[PDB]
Design brief:
Main location (chain C): secreted
GO molecular function, one term (chain C): MHC class II protein complex binding
Shape of chain B: globular
Number of strands of chain A: 0
Radius of gyration of chain A: 8 Å
Largest interface: B-C, 33 and 30 residues
Function (chain C): Component of the class I major histocompatibility complex (MHC). Involved in the presentation of peptide antigens to the immune system.
Number of domains of chain B: 2
Oligomer: heterotrimer
Chains: A little secondary structure (about 10), B alpha+beta (about 280), C mainly beta (about 100)
Radius of gyration of chain B: 23 Å
Order of helices and strands of chain B: EEEEHEEEEHHHEEEEEEEEE
Helix content of chain B: 10-25%
CATH topology of the largest domain in chain B: Murine Class I Major Histocompatibility Complex, H2-DB, Chain A, domain 1
Distance between the termini of chain A: 23 Å
CATH class of the largest domain in chain B: Alpha Beta
Family (chain C): Belongs to the beta-2-microglobulin family.
Subcellular location (chain C): Secreted
CATH superfamily of the largest domain in chain B: MHC class I-like antigen recognition-like
Largest sheet of chain B: 8 strands, antiparallel
Chain lengths: ~10, ~280, ~100
């Protein structure tokens, strides 16, 4: 399954 | 033995064409099982393997949601990138991200993956320690500090050792006959005269899985690199892979050359010779 | 950083004249992702050509597989035409049953 979460540069 | 699950994201900005295009693909080992295309007529997580196609609606709804989330994330990251490298919004740029987990033989996390590149060049990657980050340039250091400040490596590691491995095991269970299968390569040697003094020997290995394979040539039993050509492993189109290795040989020297092929599906390594 | 695509046009199974088979064009190691690929029979685009989902390898280079159904014979000539920003005009690679 896919990963969920905020990943902002 | 060891298995893996990987996700590949590609986000490409299209100045004038509106929103950037986001493409996501999912792999168990060397088998694609899911896809997501923002340019699809009805963007959604789609099954590309029979053993994942029977997952309940919840799976596909949630998967789609997370896919779109990732898309927007990559959009925001595209803007932020434009601002980091001080670039114009009229230019096209690319963000790529690969992330996944490697289930080992003891059912434990063997290795974790979380790496991202900007415009075809390393941007920021998760280290083997699964604790620290590596930034390629000064622009990526901003991101590194941001992720250090919000304990991102820890959280994503929680994903790695948990949900990731769980779903990987689930897939491996549901796709037993397909994923835990090791198809040996159908091999054969061909002869193709170049002139009256030289001829090319081509070793063929077809329809094998997984993609990992070793293919070499030997003269008199000695390894040969000179006058040799090995093509990149290519997909068959049916889930298998192909590969051939050729060597230019003086006419009359053919029977002194041997092709060696080792693959996971092979009970024993193969020693082949031209069989006219 | 932009990279020139590698091209491999080949059949799925060992080619036999009059025997149904699958024509493949594998285009890898290119960047950026923007690219055009066509499968031609006797210089003309074939009827039903599809491609795989865009993906990339460790070195971040993209790879795509365009494919169609074809039945090889000694008279007809199959090829793969690729347009990319790194290429000065379209590059055409003819199918060779020895490769």
């Amino acid at each position: 399954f896919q990963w969920m979460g905020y990943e902002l540069w | 033995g060891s298995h893996s699950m990987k996700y590949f994201y590609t986000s490409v900005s299209r100045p004038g064409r509106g929103e950037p295009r986001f493409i996501s693909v999912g792999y168990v080992d060397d088998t694609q099982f899911v896809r997501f295309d923002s340019d699809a007529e009805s963007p959604r997580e789609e099954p590309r393997a029979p053993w994942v196609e029977q997952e309940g609606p919840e799976y596909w709804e949630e998967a789609t949601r997370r896919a779109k989330e990732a898309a927007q994330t990559h959009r925001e990251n595209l803007r932020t990138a434009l601002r980091y490298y001080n670039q114009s919004e009229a230019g096209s740029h690319t963000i790529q991200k690969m992330y996944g987990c490697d289930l080992g033989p003891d059912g434990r996390l063997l290795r974790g993956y979380h790496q991202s590149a900007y415009d075809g060049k390393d941007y920021i990657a998760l280290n083997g320690d699964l604790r620290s980050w590596t930034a390629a340039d000064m622009a990526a250091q901003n991101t590194q500090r941001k992720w250090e400040g919000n304990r991102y490596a820890e959280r994503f590691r929680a994903y790695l050792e948990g949900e990731c491995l769980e779903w990987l095991r689930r897939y491996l269970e549901n796709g037993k006959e397909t994923l835990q299968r090791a198809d040996p390569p159908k091999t054969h040697v061909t002869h193709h005269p170049v002139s009256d003094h030289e001829a090319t020997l081509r070793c063929w290995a077809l329809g094998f899985y997984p993609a990992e394979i070793t293919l070499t040539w030997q003269r008199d039993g000695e390894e040969q690199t000179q006058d040799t050509e090995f093509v990149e492993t290519r997909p068959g189109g049916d889930g298998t892979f192909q590969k051939w290795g050729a060597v230019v040989v003086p006419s009359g020297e053919e029977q002194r050359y041997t092709c060696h092929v080792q693959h996971e599906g092979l009970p024993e390594p193969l020693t082949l010779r031209w069989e006219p | 950083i932009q990279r020139t695509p590698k091209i491999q046009v080949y059949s799925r199974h060992p080619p036999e004249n009059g025997k149904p088979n699958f024509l493949n064009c594998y285009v890898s190691g290119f960047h950026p992702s923007d690219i055009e690929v066509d499968l031609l029979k006797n210089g003309e685009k074939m009827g039903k050509v599809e491609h795989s989902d865009l993906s990339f390898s460790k070195d971040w280079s993209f790879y795509l597989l365009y494919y169609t159904e074809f039945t090889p014979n000694e008279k007809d000539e199959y090829a793969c035409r690729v347009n990319h920003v790194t290429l000065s005009g379209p590059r055409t690679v003819k199918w060779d049953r020895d490769m």
